[PDB]
Amino acid sequence: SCDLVVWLVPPQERLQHLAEGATESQFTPPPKVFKIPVHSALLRISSPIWLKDLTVVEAKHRTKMKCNRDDDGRVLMKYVIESFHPAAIRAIIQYIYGYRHEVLQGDPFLQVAVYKEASRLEMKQLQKEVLRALSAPMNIGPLVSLAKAAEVMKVDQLLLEAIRILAGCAYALFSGMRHLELGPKGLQLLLLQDNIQLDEPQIYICANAWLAQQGVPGVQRDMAMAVYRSIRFDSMSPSQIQVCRDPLLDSLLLEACLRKFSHLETKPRVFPWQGNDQFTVERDGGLYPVLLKRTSRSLIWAWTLGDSRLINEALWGIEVVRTAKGRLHFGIAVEDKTTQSRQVCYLDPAEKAFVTGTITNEPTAVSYRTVQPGGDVRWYRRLCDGDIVIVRVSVTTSAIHLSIQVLKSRSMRASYMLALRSPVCFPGQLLQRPFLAIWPFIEAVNIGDTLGVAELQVEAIDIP
Amino acid sequence: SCDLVVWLVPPQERLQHLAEGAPPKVFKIPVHSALLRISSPIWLKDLTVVEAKHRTKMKCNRDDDGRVLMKYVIESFHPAAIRAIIQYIYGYRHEVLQGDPFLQVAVYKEASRLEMKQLQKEVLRALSAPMNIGPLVSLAKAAEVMKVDQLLL
Amino acid sequence: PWVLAAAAEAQRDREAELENLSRAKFPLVSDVFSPEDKAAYLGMLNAYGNPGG
Amino acid sequence: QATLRLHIASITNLQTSGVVPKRGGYPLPQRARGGVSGANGAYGLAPCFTICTVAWFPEEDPLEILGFAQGAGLRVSSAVNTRPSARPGAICLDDAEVQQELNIPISILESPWQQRMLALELGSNFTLWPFLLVSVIQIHPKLSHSLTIGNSPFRPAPVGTQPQNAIGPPQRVRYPTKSPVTVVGTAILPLKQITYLQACRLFRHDVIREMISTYREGLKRLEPVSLLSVIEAYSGRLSPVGEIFVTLNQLKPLTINPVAHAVWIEIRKVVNVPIYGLTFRQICEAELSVVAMWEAERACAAILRRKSRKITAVTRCEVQPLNISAIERMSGSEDSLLSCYIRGQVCLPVYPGLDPSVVLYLCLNGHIYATLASPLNLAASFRAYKLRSFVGQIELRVFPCPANGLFMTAAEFAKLNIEGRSN
Amino acid sequence: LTGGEVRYYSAFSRLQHSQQLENDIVHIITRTTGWEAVMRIRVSRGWKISARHGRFFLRGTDLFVLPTVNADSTFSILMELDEQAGAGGPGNALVTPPSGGDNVVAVQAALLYTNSDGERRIRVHTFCMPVSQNIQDIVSSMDPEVVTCLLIQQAIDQSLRSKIADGRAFLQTSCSQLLSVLHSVGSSTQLAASYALPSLPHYGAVAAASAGNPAGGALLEAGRLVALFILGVLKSNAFRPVKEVSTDKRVFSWSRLLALPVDRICAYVHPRMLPLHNLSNFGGPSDRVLDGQEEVILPPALRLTAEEMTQDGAYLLENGEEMLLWIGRSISPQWLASVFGAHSLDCVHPDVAAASIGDSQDPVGLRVRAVVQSVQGEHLCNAMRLLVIRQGDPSEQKFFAQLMEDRVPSLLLTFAEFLQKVDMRS
C-alpha cells in the first residue's frame, strides 16, 4: 500500500541551456533520476511545505478517479522534487519512516546537506536532531562548508559558531586558496577572533586574494575597506608595512605609526610561541614572535609554555629550519586539573611513545614525568631542515585528541588521545562544542632548533 | 478526520422472529478512522471495503456530492467495548483497567477478533491485580455469559 | 551450497580414524596376538619384567 | 540491439568490514575503521559505509569501469549509504537499499568474435553472454582526524574545477597508489536462466577475481574455456559475503540510433625488433610482452603491469646478429635483430572520450622498446605496422568492438554536454 | 604453601588502574581472618583422600597447616575408594556402625583458628552422603557446577607435571566418559541426536534447577550443562592457546582456579551476559531510588552465544576478573547521553566510562547504575574491573572470547559440534 512515487530528478528541465547551476566538480557530480515509493500517509503530517505542495498534487490527481467508473488497479501520484543537491531528499524519507542512521550519525558533508533541507523546506524540529550530529569530532572539513551553509540561508547564529571554532582552524581556511570559497557577509566576522595563529603578512597576502576574483560600488567602497581595518595592521615591523603602498587604504590604516611609538597597542593575534628564561622572542619588529632562537644565558632539558586560546578544532602550524636528527618535543598542555599544576603531552622522539606529565611553573623544572599507553607512531622518515611538522588537536566532552603530522610522506602520523579533561565547559547555543583553553606547549633539546611560523603552502592539506 | 457516522448496530442472528428477554448502542461519534487502522488490519479490511463502496456511489456522480461522512458497520451486542479500545489508543487507560467486568470481558473478545495479543496479556494481568471478591465473582459471571472458557477457568 | 556448507573444520576424530587405515598401521599387542596367546605373554611379564619393582 | 537492465535493490547482510567476529585477528582494516584516527580511543566500524554497485561482463574489469563513469552504457550505481544490519546475531554485518536500475546495453544478438572463440570453445571441430557479475565496491572513508585528501562521493569545492576526473586528454591518467576503493564482493548472476525478487550470493571478490583471471587468460591465448567450468571447478575457495536481491524479466527491447567498447587486438608475431643494448642471451631470457594502450594513457607504467592490457610470449625468441659480413666482422654491437610468435588477443575497453588510437608498445621485460610506428588511429589481415626505437614490423588484426560500426572521436562525444561531463 | 592471594593487576599505570588496588586492599585487610590455623580433614573408613587442592602446606599425611585462613578459603578434596579399608572387616559394607546398617559416609573438617577477639574456636563442618548400589540415582544426584570444577583441579595437575595439551585432552576424554554413562543409564535413543543448549541458572542455584524437566530429560540437560562448562574452560584464558595468552596470565588463571569457591570458578568458566540497551523495558514501572533493598530485577541471563546480539544493543559481561561492556554499533544516542555524558560512542573515553557511570540522573541512567553495581557487589570484593569496548576498539578480542558457545577463533568449535565430538567417542 505505497500508492506514491517521488520521482527525484535533475533540475530545471533545461539540460542544454544551463551553464551556472552547480558548475563545480565537488558538491554536485551526478544526475539524480530516482524513484522512491513512499506509503502515502506518514508524509504530509510532518511537513508544512510538503503539505502545501501535496494537497494540490492530490487535487489535480483526483481529476480522473473522482469522475471515473473503473480501473481500480494501482495508479501512483507524481509529486516530483526538483533539486541539484545529490543525496539531500533521500535522508528524510528515512527520517519520517522512523529508522534513520544517516541524519543522527551518518557520513559528514551530509550533516551539512540534510540541514539544507531544514532551511529550504521549513524543518524546525529537525534542526535539533541534525545539530547533535554536527556535535562530533569532524575532520575540519564539513565546517568550512558549514560556513558556506549559514551564508546562503542567513540565520546569523550558525554562522557565529561556525567561525569561532574554525578560528582555531586557521592555516586550513587560508592554506590552499580555500578562503577563495568563503563568501562575503560572514567573512567580516573573521579576522576579529583572537584565535587565528598565522603571521600577519600571511593574513595580508590571503586577504588580497578575496578582494580580487569578484570584479576587481557600494560594498566595493564599504567592506572593501572594512577588511583592512579588520586585519590587525598593528604589531608589524615597519619593513613589512612599507610594502602596503597603493592609492588606497591610507586614512583607514590611519597611523602605521603612533600606536607603535606610545607603548599601548591593539589586541595581539593570539600569543603563539613566546619565549621566557632560556628561550626569547625574536621579533619581526612590532610585537609578534616569528622565530625562536635558543638563548642560553651562559644541557638543559626543560620546557616552554604559552597563553590562552579557547578552541574546538585547531591545527596550528609549526615549521623547523635547522635540526640535527630529531631533538624536538611537542604535545599540548591543558588548563583544568583540580589541584591546578598542569598536565602536558610530550612527543618522545626516541622510543616512539606518547608521554604525559605535570608542571609546577619555574620553567627549568620537571615533576614526575611518565609514559602513556596508546602510542600509535612509528619512526620511518628522518626530519631534516625545512620541514612542515604541524600539530592539530581536537576536543571532546571527556577527552582530548592530538596529532603531529609532516606533509612530505605517506608516513609521519603521530596520534594520541589525552585522558579526561575533568570539568565541564559547554558554550552551547544550539550546539555542543566544548571549549577548554588549552595552552600550546613546545620543547626543544640542544642549542639551536629555531622552529618558527609555517609558510602558507601552495596546494592543500585537509578539505578538498 | 471529520468523519465516522459509524452506524454500529447490535445484530440479531438467532433472533429472527423473537428476541430473548434481556441498550442498543447505535453510535454517532465525531472522531477519525485512524484508530481502526492502528488497531488491526482486520478492521482495516472492512474499512477499505466500506470506504470504497461509498466512493463507488460517487464515482459516476459529479453533482450530487453532498458530504456523507465515511461510515462503518459492525454486528456486536457491545460496541462500547470498541469504544473502550478507542479511548485506550488515545492515552488514558483508566476505563480499560478499572470498570465493569461485564465490559472488560467484551474487550477481551474484541481482542480475540483483533488477533492483538498485547492487550490480551494485560487484561489477564488486570484480573491478577489486588481487587475484592465482589467483582471477582462479577467477572466470573461475565466470562460465563459470553462463554469464555479460559478467563473463567 | 555444497561447496559453501561441506567445507567444515569439524572432522578431528572423523579424519583421525582414516589414517588408522593408511600410513599409521600401529600393530599393538591385541592386534598381533590371539586372546589366548595374549594371556600367555601377560602372565610371562609376571616374573620377568621389572624384577625390582 | 538488446537493452537489458537489473534493478539492484536490497544488498543486505553484507560483511564489508571483512572481520567476521570469528576471524579473531581484529585489526579492523583501515577501510572500515571510522573515527578520530588514533589508538584504542577512537577506532571502530564507521557508523555507515559508502556502497557502489557496478555490473560488469566476464570480459572487462570492475574497479576500472568506474574510471570511465566517474561522473555518471549505464553500469555504475550511485553512492548508496549503508546501515548496521540489526536482527539477532551478526556483529559485523551490514544492510543497504541501492534501489537503482542498471541499463547495460548488451548489444549484438549475433557476432563473429564469438563464432571463432565459440568453436575453439567446443574444440573448433539471450545466449552467447551467459553471465553478468554485479560486484559491490566500497568508497574508502578516511578517519575524521587524518590530514590527507578527501574521497567522499559528496564533497565541498575549490572554485576552478568542473565535475570531472583525471583522464581528460591534457591530464595524464594517474593510478592511485593507495586504493581509493576496494571491492567487497561480486555476484555471479545466471543470465541465461534469469512477486519477482530473485536473490544472489555475494561471493568474496578474491576467489571470483582469481576465477575471472583464468577465464581471461584463456581467451588471451585463443583457448576460451566456459565460465561454468571454473564456476564449478574453482568453487572451493568460494566464500559467501552477503545477498543482493535482483529483479529479472526486463524484456530486452531494441536500442536506438552505433558505438565502440573493445578492440580485441590480436597480435600474431613480431619480425625484427632492433633490440640494442642487451646480451643476446639476456634478450631471449626476457619476456617479450606486447602491451596495448588507448593513446591518451601515453606510457603510464601502471597499465604496463595490468594483466589485461599486457600479453607476453610463450614461444621461443630468435635473436640474429646484425647486417652480417659487417657487424659480424666488427663483433660486439649489443644491437641485435629479434622476433617471436607472441600469439594472443588483448581487449582494450574504449574509454568514452579518448580519440581511438591504440599504440601497442613492446617491452622485453620493463622497458617499452618499440611503439606501433604512428598511432593506429582507428575510427575509420596484418597492417605491416612498422615499429620504432623506444626505451621493424608486426602482424595484428583489430576485431571490431561490439560487432561493427563503432569508434567515437574525442570531439564527437565531447560535443554532447552529458551530465556536464563535457562542460 | 601459606595461603595467600596472587592478585596480578598487569601493567599497573594508575589512570587505567589504582581504584582496584584501593578497594581490594580494603577487602584483604579488613575481612574475616583466622590466625595460627590448624586445618585437618578426615573421612569415614572404606574411602581415602587422594587429591588435595587449595592453598595450604602438607605436614605429615593429613595436616593442612595454614598460617591464616581467609574469607575466601576453598579446599578441594577428591575421594577415591580405599581398598584395604572397604574390605577386611566385620562391617565390610560401606560404613557399617554396630547399631545396624547406617550406610552413610561422612567427611569431617576441623579448623583450629584464632579469631579477631583473641580466643580459639574450632570451626567444624559436617557433610554426609548415603550409600547406593544403583546407577540411576548415583548419576541423578550429581551437580554439574561442581563436577566440572573437580575436573579442572585434576586438569591443572595434568598440565603442571605434564604439558598443557595433556590437560586439554583430559577434559575432552573425561567429558566423553561422563556422557557414555549418561546414555547408558538412559534408554531412549534420541537424546544423542539432541544438540540444544541447556538451562543456564545462576551460580549456587544449580542444584535441582531442572524442576519441571522430566526424569531422563533432566538427567540429560544437566549433562548438557556439564558439556557447556567443559567446553568453556577449553576456550577461556585458562586453557587457551598461546597466540593471545602470555605465560604469566596463564599462571594467574591456574593459581586462581585452585582456591576459588564454586561460585567464582563457575563465573570464570561461563559468564553472564546481560542485555542493557532497553533496560527501561526490562525493569518495572516502579522506578524507586535503587539502594539495595529495592529489587533490581536484573534482565534474564542470556545464553553466551553469538546467536542473539542485535547490532544496536549494548551488553555487559561478567566473569569475576575482567567485566566487559561491549556497547556496539548503532546504539540509540538518547540512551548514550543518558548513561555516558557525550553525544556519540566516539567521544566515550574507555576509562572514564568505567569510573563515572550514569551522571545525568536519568531514570534510564539509574537503571544502568543498579545493573553494574549489583553485578559488582554480590560479594564484598565489589570492584572487578569494568572496561567499555565499542564495536571496533581492538580490545574486543576479550569480549568475543568470553563467548562459550560460538566458535571462538582460538578453538574453532560450536557447542553443537563439540557435542558431536564427545557423543561419538562415548
UniProtKB/TrEMBL annotation, chain A:
This is GYF domain-containing protein. It comes from Toxoplasma gondii (strain ATCC 50611 / Me49).
From TrEMBL, chain C:
It comes from the Eukaryota. This is Filamin/ABP280 repeat-containing protein.
From TrEMBL, chain D:
It comes from the Eukaryota. Transmembrane segments: none annotated. This is Filamin/ABP280 repeat-containing protein. It comes from Toxoplasma gondii (strain ATCC 50611 / Me49).
From TrEMBL, chain E:
It is found in: Cytoplasm; Endoplasmic reticulum membrane; Golgi apparatus membrane. It comes from Toxoplasma gondii. Residues 34-132 form the Sec23/Sec24 beta-sandwich domain. Signal peptide: none annotated. Residues 296-343 form the Gelsolin-like domain. GO terms for molecular function: SNARE binding; zinc ion binding. Keywords: Cytoplasm, Endoplasmic reticulum, ER-Golgi transport, Golgi apparatus, Membrane, Protein transport, Transport. The chain holds residues 568 to 993 of 1019 of the full protein. Residues 143-265 form the Sec23/Sec24 helical domain. GO terms for cellular component: COPII vesicle coat; endoplasmic reticulum exit site; endoplasmic reticulum membrane; Golgi membrane. Belongs to the SEC23/SEC24 family. SEC24 subfamily. GO terms for biological process: COPII-coated vesicle cargo loading; intracellular protein transport. This is Putative transport protein Sec24.
